[PDB]
PDB file of C-alpha atoms and ligand atoms in Angstrom:
ATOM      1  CA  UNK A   1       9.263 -11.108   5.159  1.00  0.00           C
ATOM      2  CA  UNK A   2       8.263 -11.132   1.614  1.00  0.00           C
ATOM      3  CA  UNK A   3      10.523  -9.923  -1.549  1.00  0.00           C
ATOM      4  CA  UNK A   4      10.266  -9.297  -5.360  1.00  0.00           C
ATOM      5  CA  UNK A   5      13.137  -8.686  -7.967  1.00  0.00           C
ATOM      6  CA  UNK A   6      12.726  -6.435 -11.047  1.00  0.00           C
ATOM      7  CA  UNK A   7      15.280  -8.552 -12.834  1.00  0.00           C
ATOM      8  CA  UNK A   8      13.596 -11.081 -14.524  1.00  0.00           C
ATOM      9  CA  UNK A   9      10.021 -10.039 -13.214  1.00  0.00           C
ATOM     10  CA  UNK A  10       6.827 -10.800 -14.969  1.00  0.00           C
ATOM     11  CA  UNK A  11       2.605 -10.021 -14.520  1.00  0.00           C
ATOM     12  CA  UNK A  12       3.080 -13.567 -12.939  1.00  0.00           C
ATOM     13  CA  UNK A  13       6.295 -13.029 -10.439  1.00  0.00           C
ATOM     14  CA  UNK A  14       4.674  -9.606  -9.516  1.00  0.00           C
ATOM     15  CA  UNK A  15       0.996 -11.453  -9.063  1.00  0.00           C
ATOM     16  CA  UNK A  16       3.187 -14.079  -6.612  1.00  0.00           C
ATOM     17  CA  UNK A  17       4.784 -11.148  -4.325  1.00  0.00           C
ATOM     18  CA  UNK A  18       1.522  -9.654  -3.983  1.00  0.00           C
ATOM     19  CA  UNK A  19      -0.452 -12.701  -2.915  1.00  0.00           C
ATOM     20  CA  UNK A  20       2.633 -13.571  -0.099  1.00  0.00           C
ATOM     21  CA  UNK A  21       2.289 -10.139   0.601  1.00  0.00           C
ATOM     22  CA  UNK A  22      -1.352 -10.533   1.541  1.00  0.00           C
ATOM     23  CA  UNK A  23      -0.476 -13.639   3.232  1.00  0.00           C
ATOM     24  CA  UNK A  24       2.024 -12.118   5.309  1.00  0.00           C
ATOM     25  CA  UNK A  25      -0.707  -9.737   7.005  1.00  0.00           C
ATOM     26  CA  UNK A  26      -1.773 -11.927  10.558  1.00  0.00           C
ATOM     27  CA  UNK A  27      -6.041 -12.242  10.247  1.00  0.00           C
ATOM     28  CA  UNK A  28      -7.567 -14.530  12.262  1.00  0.00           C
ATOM     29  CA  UNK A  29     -11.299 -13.910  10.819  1.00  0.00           C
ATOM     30  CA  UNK A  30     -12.645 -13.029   7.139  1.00  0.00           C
ATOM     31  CA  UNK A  31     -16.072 -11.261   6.495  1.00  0.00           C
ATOM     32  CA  UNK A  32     -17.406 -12.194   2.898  1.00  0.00           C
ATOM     33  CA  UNK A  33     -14.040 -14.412   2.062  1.00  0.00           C
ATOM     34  CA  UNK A  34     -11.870 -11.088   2.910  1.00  0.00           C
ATOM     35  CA  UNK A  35      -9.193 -10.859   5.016  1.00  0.00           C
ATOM     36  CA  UNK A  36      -9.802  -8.740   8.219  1.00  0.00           C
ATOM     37  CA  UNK A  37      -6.955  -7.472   9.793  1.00  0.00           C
ATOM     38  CA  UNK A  38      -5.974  -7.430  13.174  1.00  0.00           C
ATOM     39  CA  UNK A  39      -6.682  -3.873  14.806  1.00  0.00           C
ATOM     40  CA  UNK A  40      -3.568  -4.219  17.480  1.00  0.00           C
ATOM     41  CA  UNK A  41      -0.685  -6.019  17.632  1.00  0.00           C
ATOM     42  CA  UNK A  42       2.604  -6.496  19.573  1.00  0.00           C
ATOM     43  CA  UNK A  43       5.644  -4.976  18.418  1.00  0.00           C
ATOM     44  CA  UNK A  44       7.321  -8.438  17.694  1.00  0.00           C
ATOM     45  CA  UNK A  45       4.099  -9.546  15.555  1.00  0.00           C
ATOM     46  CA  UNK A  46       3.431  -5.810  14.166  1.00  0.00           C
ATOM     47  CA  UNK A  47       5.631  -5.185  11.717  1.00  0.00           C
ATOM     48  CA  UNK A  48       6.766  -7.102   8.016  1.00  0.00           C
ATOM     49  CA  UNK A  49       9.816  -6.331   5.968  1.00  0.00           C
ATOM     50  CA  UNK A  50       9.303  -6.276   1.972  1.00  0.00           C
ATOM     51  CA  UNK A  51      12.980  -6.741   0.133  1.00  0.00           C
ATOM     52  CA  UNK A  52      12.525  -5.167  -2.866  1.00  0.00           C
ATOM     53  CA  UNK A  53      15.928  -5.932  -5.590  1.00  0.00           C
ATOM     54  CA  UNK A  54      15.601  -3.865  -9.413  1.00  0.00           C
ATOM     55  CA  UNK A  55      16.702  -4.306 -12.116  1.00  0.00           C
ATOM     56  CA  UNK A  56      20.545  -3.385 -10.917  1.00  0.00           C
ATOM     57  CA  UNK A  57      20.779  -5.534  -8.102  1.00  0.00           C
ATOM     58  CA  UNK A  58      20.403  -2.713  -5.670  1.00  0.00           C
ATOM     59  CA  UNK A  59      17.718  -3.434  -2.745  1.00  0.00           C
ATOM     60  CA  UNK A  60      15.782  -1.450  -0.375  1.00  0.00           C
ATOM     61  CA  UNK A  61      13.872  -3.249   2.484  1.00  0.00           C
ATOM     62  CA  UNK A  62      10.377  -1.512   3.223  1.00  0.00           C
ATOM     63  CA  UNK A  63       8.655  -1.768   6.695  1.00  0.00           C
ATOM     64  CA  UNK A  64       5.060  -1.714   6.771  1.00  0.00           C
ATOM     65  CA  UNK A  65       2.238  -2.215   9.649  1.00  0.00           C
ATOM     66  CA  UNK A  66       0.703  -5.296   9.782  1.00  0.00           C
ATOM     67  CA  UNK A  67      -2.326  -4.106  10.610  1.00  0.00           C
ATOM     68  CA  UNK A  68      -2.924  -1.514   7.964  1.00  0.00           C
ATOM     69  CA  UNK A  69      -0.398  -2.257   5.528  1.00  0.00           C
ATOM     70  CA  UNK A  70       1.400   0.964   5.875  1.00  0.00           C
ATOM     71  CA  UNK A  71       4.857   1.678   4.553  1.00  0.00           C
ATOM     72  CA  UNK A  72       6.806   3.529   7.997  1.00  0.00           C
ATOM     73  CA  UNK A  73       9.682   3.617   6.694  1.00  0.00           C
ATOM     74  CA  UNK A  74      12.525   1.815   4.606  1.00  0.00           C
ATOM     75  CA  UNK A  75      16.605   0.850   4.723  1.00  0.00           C
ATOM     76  CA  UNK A  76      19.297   0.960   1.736  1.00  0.00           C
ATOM     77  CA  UNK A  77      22.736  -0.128   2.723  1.00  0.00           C
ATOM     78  CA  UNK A  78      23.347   1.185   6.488  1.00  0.00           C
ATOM     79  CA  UNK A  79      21.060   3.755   6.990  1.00  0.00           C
ATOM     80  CA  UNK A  80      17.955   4.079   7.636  1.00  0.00           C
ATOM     81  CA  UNK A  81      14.107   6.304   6.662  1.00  0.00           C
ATOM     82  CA  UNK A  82      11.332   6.463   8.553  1.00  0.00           C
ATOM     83  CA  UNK A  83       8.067   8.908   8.303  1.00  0.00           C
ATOM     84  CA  UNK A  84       7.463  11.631  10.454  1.00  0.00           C
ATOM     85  CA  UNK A  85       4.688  10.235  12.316  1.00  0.00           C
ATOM     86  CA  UNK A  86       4.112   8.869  16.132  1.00  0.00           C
ATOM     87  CA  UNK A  87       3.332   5.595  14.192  1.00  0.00           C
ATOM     88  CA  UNK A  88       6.670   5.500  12.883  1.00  0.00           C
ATOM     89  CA  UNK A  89       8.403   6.449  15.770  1.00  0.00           C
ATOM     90  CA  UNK A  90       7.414   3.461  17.051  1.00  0.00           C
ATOM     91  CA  UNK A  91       8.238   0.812  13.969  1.00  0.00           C
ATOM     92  CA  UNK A  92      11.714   2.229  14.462  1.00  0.00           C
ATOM     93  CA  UNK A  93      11.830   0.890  18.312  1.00  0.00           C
ATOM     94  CA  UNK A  94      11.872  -2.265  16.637  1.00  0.00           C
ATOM     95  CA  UNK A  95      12.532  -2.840  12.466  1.00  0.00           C
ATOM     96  CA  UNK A  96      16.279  -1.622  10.949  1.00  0.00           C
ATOM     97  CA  UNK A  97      17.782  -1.090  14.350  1.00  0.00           C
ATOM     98  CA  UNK A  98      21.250  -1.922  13.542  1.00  0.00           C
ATOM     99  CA  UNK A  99      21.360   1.052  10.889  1.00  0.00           C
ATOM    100  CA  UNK A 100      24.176   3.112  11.209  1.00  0.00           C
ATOM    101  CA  UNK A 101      22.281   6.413  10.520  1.00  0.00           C
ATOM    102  CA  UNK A 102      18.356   6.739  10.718  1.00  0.00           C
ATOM    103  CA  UNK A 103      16.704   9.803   9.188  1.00  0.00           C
ATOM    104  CA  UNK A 104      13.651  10.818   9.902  1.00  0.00           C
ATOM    105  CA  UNK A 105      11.859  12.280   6.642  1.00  0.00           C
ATOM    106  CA  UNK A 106      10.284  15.877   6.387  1.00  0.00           C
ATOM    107  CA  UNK A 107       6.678  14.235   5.966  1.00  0.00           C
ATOM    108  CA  UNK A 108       3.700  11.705   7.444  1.00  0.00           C
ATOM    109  CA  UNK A 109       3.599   9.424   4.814  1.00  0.00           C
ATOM    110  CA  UNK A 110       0.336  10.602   3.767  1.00  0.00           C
ATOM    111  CA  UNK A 111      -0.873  11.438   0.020  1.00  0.00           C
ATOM    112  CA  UNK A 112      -1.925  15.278   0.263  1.00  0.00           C
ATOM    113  CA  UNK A 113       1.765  15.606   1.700  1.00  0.00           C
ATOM    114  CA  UNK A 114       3.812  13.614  -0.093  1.00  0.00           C
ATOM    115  CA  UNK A 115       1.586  15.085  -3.341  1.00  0.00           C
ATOM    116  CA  UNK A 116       3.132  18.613  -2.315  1.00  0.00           C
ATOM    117  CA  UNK A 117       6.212  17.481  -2.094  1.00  0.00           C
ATOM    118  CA  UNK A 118       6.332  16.069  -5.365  1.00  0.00           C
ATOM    119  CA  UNK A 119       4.383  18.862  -6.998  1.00  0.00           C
ATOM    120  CA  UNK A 120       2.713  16.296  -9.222  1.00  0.00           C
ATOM    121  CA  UNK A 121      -1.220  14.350  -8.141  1.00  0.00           C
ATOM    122  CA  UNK A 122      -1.326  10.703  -8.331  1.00  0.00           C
ATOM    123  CA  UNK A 123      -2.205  10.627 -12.101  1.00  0.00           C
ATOM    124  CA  UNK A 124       0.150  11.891 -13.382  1.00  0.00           C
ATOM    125  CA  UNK A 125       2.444   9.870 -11.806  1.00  0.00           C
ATOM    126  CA  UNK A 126       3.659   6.601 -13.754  1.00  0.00           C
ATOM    127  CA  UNK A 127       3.432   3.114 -12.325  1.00  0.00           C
ATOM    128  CA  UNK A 128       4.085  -0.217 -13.883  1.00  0.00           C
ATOM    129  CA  UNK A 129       7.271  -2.561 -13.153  1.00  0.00           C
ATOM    130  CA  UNK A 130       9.601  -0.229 -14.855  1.00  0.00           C
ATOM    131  CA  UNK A 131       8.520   2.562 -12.914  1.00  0.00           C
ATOM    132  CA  UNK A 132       8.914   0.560  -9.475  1.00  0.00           C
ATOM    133  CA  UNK A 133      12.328   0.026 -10.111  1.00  0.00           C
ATOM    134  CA  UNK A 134      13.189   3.432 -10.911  1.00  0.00           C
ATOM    135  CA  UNK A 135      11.752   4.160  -7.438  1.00  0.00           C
ATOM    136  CA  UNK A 136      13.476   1.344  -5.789  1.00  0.00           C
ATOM    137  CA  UNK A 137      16.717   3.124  -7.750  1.00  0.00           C
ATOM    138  CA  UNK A 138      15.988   6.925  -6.014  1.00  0.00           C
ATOM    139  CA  UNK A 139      15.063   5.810  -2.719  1.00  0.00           C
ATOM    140  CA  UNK A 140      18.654   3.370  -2.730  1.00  0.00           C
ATOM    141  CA  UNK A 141      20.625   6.963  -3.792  1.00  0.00           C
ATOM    142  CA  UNK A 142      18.139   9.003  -1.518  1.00  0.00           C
ATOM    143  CA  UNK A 143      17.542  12.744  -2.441  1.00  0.00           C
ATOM    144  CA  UNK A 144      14.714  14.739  -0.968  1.00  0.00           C
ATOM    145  CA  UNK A 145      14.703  16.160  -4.923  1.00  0.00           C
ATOM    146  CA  UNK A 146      13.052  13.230  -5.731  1.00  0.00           C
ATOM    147  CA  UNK A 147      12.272  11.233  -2.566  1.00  0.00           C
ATOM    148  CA  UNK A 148       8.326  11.820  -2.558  1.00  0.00           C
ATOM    149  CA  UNK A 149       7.300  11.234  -5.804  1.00  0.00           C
ATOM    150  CA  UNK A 150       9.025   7.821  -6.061  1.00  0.00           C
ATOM    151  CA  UNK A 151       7.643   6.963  -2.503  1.00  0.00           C
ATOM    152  CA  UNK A 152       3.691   7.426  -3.840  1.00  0.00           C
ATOM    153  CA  UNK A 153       5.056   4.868  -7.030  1.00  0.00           C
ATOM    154  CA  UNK A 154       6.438   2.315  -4.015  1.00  0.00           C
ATOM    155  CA  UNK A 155       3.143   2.913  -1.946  1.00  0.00           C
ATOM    156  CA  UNK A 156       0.695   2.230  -4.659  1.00  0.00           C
ATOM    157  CA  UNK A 157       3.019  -0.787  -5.795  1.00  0.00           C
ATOM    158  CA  UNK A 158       2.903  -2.480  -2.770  1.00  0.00           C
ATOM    159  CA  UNK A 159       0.341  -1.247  -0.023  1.00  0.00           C
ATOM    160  CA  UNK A 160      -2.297  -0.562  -2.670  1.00  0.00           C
ATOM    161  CA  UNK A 161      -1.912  -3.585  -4.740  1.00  0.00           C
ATOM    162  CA  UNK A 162      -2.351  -5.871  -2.245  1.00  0.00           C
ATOM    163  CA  UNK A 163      -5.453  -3.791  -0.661  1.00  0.00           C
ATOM    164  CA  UNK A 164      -7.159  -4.271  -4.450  1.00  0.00           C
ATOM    165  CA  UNK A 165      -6.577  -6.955  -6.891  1.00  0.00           C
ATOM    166  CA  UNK A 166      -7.532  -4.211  -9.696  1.00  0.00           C
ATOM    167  CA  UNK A 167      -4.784  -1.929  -8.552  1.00  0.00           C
ATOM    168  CA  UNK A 168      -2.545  -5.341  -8.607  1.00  0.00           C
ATOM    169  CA  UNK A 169      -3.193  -6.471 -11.735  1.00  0.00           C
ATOM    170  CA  UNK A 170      -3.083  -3.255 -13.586  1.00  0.00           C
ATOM    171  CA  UNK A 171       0.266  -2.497 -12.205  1.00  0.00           C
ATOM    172  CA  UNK A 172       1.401  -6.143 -13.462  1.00  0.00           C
ATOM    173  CA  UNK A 173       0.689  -5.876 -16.447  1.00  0.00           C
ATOM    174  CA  UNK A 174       2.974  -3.075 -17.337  1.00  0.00           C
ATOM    175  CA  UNK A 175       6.455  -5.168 -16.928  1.00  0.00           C
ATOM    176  CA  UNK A 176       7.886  -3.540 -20.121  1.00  0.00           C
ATOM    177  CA  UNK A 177       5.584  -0.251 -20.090  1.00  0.00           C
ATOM    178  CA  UNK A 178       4.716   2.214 -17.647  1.00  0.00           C
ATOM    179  CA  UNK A 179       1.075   4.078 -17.584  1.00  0.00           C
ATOM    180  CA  UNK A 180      -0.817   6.660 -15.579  1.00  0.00           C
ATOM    181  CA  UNK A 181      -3.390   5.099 -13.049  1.00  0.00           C
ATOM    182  CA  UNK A 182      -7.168   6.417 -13.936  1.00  0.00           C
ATOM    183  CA  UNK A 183      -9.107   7.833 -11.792  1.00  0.00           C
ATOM    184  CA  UNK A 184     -10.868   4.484 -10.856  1.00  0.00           C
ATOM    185  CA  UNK A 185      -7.473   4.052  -8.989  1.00  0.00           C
ATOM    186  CA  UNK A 186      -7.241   7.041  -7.318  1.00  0.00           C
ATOM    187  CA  UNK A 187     -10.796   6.035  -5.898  1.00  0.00           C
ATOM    188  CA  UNK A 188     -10.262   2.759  -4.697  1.00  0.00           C
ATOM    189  CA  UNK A 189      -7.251   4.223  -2.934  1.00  0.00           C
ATOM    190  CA  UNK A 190      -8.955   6.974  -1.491  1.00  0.00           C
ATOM    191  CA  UNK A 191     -11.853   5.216  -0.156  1.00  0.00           C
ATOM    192  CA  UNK A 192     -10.189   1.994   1.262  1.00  0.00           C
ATOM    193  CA  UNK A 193     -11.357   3.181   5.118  1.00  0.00           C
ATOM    194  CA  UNK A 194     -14.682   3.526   4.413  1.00  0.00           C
ATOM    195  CA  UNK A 195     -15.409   0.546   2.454  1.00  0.00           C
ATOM    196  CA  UNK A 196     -13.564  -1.731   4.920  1.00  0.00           C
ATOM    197  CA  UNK A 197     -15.713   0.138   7.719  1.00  0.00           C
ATOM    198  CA  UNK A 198     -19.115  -0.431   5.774  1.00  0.00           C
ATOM    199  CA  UNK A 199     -18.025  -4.087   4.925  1.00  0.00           C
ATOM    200  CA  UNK A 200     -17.938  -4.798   8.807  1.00  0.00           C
ATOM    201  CA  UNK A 201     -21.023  -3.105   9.091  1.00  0.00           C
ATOM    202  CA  UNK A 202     -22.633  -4.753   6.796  1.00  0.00           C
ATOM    203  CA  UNK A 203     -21.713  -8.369   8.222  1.00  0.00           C
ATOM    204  CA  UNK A 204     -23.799  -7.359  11.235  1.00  0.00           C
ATOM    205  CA  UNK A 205     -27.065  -5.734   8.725  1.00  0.00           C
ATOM    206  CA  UNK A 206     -27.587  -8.352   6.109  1.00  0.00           C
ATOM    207  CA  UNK A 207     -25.202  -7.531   3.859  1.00  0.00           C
ATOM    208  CA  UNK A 208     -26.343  -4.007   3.863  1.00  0.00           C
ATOM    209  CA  UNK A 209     -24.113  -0.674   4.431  1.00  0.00           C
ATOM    210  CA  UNK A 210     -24.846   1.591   6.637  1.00  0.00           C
ATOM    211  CA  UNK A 211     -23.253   4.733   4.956  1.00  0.00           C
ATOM    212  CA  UNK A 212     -23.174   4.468   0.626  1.00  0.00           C
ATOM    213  CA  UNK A 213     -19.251   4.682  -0.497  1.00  0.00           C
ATOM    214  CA  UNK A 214     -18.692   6.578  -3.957  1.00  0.00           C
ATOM    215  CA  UNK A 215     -16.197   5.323  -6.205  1.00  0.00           C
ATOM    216  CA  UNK A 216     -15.223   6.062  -9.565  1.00  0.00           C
ATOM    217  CA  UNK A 217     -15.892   3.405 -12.156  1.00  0.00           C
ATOM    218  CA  UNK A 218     -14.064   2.136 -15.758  1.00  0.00           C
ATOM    219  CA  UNK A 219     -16.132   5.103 -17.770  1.00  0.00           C
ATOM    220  CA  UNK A 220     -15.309   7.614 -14.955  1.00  0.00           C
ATOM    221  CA  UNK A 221     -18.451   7.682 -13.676  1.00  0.00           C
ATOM    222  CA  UNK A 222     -18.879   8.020 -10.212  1.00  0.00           C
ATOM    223  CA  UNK A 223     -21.377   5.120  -8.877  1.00  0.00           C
ATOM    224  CA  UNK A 224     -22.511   4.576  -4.789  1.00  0.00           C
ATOM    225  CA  UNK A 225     -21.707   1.466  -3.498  1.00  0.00           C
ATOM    226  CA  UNK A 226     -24.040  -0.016  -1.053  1.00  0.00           C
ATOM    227  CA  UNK A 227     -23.555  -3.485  -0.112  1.00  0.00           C
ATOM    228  CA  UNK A 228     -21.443  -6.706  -0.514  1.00  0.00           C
ATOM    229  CA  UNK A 229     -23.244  -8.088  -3.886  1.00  0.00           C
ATOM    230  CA  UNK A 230     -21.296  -4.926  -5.185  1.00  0.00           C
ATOM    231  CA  UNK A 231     -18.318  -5.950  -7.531  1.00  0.00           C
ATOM    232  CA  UNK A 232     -15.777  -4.198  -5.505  1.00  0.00           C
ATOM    233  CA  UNK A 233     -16.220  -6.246  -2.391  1.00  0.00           C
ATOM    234  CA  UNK A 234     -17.291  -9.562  -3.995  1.00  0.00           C
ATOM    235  CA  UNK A 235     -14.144  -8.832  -6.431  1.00  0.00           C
ATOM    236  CA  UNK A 236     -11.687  -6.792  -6.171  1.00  0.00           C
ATOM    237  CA  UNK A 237     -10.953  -5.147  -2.288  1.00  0.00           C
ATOM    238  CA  UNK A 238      -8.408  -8.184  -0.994  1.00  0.00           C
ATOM    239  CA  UNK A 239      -7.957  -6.805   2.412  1.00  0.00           C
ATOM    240  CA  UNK A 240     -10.317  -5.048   4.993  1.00  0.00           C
ATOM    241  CA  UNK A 241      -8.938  -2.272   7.302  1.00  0.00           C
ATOM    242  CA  UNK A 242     -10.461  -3.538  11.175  1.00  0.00           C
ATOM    243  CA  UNK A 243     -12.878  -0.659  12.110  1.00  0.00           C
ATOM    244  CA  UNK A 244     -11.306  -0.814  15.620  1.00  0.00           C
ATOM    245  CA  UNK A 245      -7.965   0.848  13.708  1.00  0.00           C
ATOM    246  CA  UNK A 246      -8.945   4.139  12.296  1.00  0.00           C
ATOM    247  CA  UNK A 247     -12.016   5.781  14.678  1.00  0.00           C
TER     248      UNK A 247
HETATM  249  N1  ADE B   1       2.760   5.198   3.919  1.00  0.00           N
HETATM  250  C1  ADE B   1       1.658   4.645   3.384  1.00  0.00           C
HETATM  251  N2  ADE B   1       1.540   3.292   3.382  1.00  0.00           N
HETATM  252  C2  ADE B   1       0.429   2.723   2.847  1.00  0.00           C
HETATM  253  N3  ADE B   1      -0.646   3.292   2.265  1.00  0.00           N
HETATM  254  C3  ADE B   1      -0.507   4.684   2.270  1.00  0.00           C
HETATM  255  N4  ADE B   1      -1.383   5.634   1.757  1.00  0.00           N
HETATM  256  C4  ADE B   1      -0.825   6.905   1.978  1.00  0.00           C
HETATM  257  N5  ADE B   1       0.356   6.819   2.604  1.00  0.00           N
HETATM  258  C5  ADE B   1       0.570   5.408   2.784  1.00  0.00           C
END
């Protein structure tokens, strides 16, 4: 388990949850001083509960997947939320179980669906500390109005930020100001997959990928990434997806 609380939260208390969030994930190896996570896991060891508290004292508890830092599903009070996915089916065997009332919502929780939903892309969404605990405040009073849109802000809060210390730190340093995330995020979250895949790769071909990986820079430009003296992997990706866990 691993928590953060609005109230009183700072770049610094927000940099802390994210780095014991990382630390939370099991990895027994690391390829180029990154993390590699563990592409199967028991139920018992699979799963890690993030207590989330804003600025109200009201707290939601998030499950994600150890092994790919995805959210499944979350609790506030006695009931409980999962996604509609096999995936989550199966976190709900075993995380929340003494809920009162589980529902299960109308969506995977994947981006091009929970983007529908919301009827609003990722940039123009707002993120930033202020905007995390407005989500942590519509999940706790859950309304399918308004469900999707603040589940992207609590996805890309926790899940992203700890997959990217750029995503982190630009989220940290709004604590009193919110902002839209540019493009360069959108990227790094689209493409985490396929640079953890090429990363792998790469520690068996000299450092080489096998497969370029766009990505969108600070000037909006797109550039090709192609091995591990790139800045992204010797700098910013914090956690590596194991190849054996997408296919
Ligand atoms: N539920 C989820 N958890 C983590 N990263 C995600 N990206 C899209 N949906 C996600």
């Amino acid at each position: 388990d691993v928590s953060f609380r609005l109230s009183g939260a700072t770049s610094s208390s927000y940099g802390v949850f994210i780095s014991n969030l990382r630390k939370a994930l099991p990895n027994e190896r690391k390829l180029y001083d990154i993390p590699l996570l563990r592409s199967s896991l028991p139920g018992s060891q699979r799963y890690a509960l993030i207590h989330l508290t804003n600025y109200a004292d009201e707290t939601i508890s998030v499950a994600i997947d150890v092994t790919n830092v995805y959210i499944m599903g979350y609790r506030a009070g006695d009931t409980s939320y999962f996604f509609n996915r096999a995936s989550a089916t199966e976190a709900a065997k075993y995380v929340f179980k003494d809920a009162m009332r589980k529902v299960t919502l109308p969506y995977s929780g994947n981006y091009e669906r929970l983007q529908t939903a919301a009827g609003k892309i990722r940039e123009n969404i707002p993120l930033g500390l202020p905007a995390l605990d407005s989500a942590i405040t519509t999940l706790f009073y859950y309304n399918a109005n308004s469900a999707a849109s603040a589940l992207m802000v609590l996805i890309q809060s926790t899940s992203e930020a700890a997959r990217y210390k750029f995503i982190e730190q630009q989220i940290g340093k709004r604590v009193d100001k919110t902002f839209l995330p540019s493009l360069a995020i959108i990227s790094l979250e689209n493409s985490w997959s396929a640079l953890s895949k090429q990363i792998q790769i790469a520690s068996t071909n000299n450092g080489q990928f096998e497969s370029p990986v766009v990505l969108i820079n600070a000037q909006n430009q797109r550039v090709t990434i192609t091995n591990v003296d790139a800045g992204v992997v010797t700098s910013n990706i914090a956690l590596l997806l194991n190849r054996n866990n997408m296919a």
